[PDB]
Design a binder for these strands. Structure first.
Ligand SMILES: [Zn+2]
Ligand SMILES: [Zn+2]
Ligand SMILES: [Zn+2]
Ligand SMILES: [Zn+2]
Lengths: 73, 77
DNA sequence: TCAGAACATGATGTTCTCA
DNA sequence: CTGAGAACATCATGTTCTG
């Protein structure tokens, strides 16, 4: 489906998996970024176009479960 | 030290009744901010999200419910 | 075809008015 | 010594523009 991460309209395979424009950046900034993403549920959040801004911990955990690589070095 | 009573909404050390109940400076502006502008938030979970000082940004759909449950209101005239 | 500058914003806290 | 509302100054995600 479009964005095997947020179900929004994907722009094309990004970092290895089909994603929207947003998802691209999120996963770039998440990875190269000092963070402490903490979920406020049970690590099972729904993630769509709208519901995505909500939980970063799960969304990133999604930009990890479904391939999405930065690739070594 | 520095524990001046937890926000009835989130948990952060609040500061004086705001819009009806003990809330932080954060929650104060949120509840004023959540009512005026168009919002219609969407909870990304099972409508029971923790709203402590950290995760309070995560789900404003629940924090609002928390405000509406702590009886927050603009009072009126 | 896809990267990431880069320009959009958006959302949020913490002051600092004031009465 | 209140308890509100600017308006700051801060982040966080989204869009277009660039190779
Ligand atoms: Zn996406
Ligand atoms: Zn989550
Ligand atoms: Zn609070
Ligand atoms: Zn929620």
């Amino acid at each position: 489906r479009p964005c095997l991460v947020c179900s929004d309209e994907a722009s094309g395979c990004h970092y290895g998996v089909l994603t929207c424009g947003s998802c691209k950046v999120f996963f770039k900034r998440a990875v190269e970024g000092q963070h402490n993403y903490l979920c406020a549920g049970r690590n099972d959040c729904i993630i769509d176009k709208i519901r995505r801004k909500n939980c970063p911990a799960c969304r990133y955990r999604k930009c990890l479960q479904a391939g999405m690589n930065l690739e070594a070095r």
